[PDB]
Design a protein around this ligand. Sequence first.
Ligand code: EOF
Ligand code: EOF
Lengths: 303, 303
Amino acid sequence: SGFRKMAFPSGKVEGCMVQVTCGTTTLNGLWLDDVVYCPRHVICTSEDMLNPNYEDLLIRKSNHNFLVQAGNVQLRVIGHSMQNCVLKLKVDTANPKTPKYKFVRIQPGQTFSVLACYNGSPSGVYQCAMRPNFTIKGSFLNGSCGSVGFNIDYDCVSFCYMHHMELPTGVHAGTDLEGNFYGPFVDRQTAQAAGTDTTITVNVLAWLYAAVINGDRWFLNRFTTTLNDFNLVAMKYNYEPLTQDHVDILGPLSAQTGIAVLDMCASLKELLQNGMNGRTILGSALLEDEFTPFDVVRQCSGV
Amino acid sequence: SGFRKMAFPSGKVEGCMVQVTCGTTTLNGLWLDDVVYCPRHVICTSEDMLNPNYEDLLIRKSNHNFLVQAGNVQLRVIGHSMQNCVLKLKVDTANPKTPKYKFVRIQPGQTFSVLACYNGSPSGVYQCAMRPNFTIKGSFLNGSCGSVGFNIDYDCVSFCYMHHMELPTGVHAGTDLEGNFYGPFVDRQTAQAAGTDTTITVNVLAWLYAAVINGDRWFLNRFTTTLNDFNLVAMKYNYEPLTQDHVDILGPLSAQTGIAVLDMCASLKELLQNGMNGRTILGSALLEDEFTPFDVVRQCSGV
Ligand SMILES: *C(=O)[C@H](C[C@@H]1CCNC1=O)NC(=O)[C@H](CC(C)C)NC(=O)/C=C/c1ccccc1
Ligand SMILES: *C(=O)[C@H](C[C@@H]1CCNC1=O)NC(=O)[C@H](CC(C)C)NC(=O)/C=C/c1ccccc1
């Protein structure tokens, strides 16, 4: 029993983190086979940050302008190329610690683990969700760019995020490992706003099922609701519409607890309309939306 | 910027996790040099759980009653002994992945990372605090015993917790790595209650400083308070007394934000007396007490 924001074990990714320096700029890179992946803004200087032309900065660079260090072993760069907003630095050594891996792009509402790193050295690990507005609410300081986000299935690491920047609101923005940004952000020093965010409804429901599985039942009721009448309430509270596919995805959790999905919807509607009146759910006074149904099943399987 | 419940990178501990089976009971062990550490209740049977006499079960055991597996490599047990509530299984192979390590016992109010494991295989990592009543609010299922809690400084893993049991309230109890329980718990299948818990005051203050460092300032005021008048309020809300040593420990955070400790105490007093009135601090509608001052400095250093 218990329910915690749980990250994947980070060892397999720790073995892939290197330090990449260009000029006076040092950040993190991801070393897989004989390629090191890092944010392309490592080649930028303070004088070309409003609108850097990246193919230009890059054409003016050599292999010997890139210093790659794995621990305290220097890697020789033998090739460089740009892939959207990431640099691919070919090195003369394949990483002997390369795990089986995939480059996957995730969907808003999905979760992943972030291994925060500085100077190629892992600092901490925590769980993030991709917000509906394609930002993440992370914990990143200067020097953290190139830190990655990932999921693990079996023994295969699915990389899904590389960190590039922080917005004025304090949330974070980055790319998939093909260098394509999540959301309408660009790797340049503005002054960029995220679109309006919303609450991930299917996740809130998943977390209520986690609560029931852990013995928190006070929010349940006899009411049921139609999917239509629920989504009418959801839209008023800035919650994403709940689809039949979300209902199907919640199937196993519904079956394990004997609470129909539309019944839990009726509990959610009351919570949205009345609040909690000073009670908590799984230790929170807020409705939590950064646990997926999979996260709940993975952590609560067999009570 | 940002503030997340952050665990230490788990790689160094992942390399130490093994599977230990005795009879039909399988749980996790910690393999350091040529010793495997695990909960002694691995030698118990269903018929001897109310009051197992452990020296008895142990005298009746041989080395060949213990099957130790590291991944899919079997380790030969060449010696066994009991140290309080842990078993020490001497094996014929020193773990080549042994990190530099220490066995440290922590204090209530201190935090650590837990690597949850099943069948010797790491499942997830998350951050825990030792509660004032010597329980932890973790996430543990059947098969998780022998999972460990730890901190890292530099490259040295300080192990502080091994998991043994869950209480009826859903909180968790275990030992240090010398096998000595945290709190008044025993490794037998009762029905055991924790003493009354309290809120870790110095940590709540640390987290308010984190909030200010991250731009959440709405709870600040011009009031200051005496340490005496604050502790009068704290005792009424089940908060631990704040000592001068706690005030000194908060020194660096006070200096970084320019908010005197006793000034933040005055903010805390108002929050305890009025609540938040629907506002949040660092994304929480509750006052968070599982971040130490060190946790805050480590994550917020340089804004
Ligand atoms: C990379 O390490 C760094 C990570 C930042 C630093 C602070 N928190 C983070 O996540 N990325 C950058 O510094 C990035 C560089 C660009 C050339 C892409 N710029 C930003 O993150 C912020 C730009 C900004 C923010 C707010 C107002 C105006 C500009
Ligand atoms: C070890 O893997 C296991 C972990 C439990 C299982 C469920 N959540 C956990 O943390 N430890 C035990 O099962 C332990 C065995 C004893 C012989 C020490 N017993 C318990 O955790 C619970 C005992 C209990 C709880 C509630 C009411 C009555 C008894």
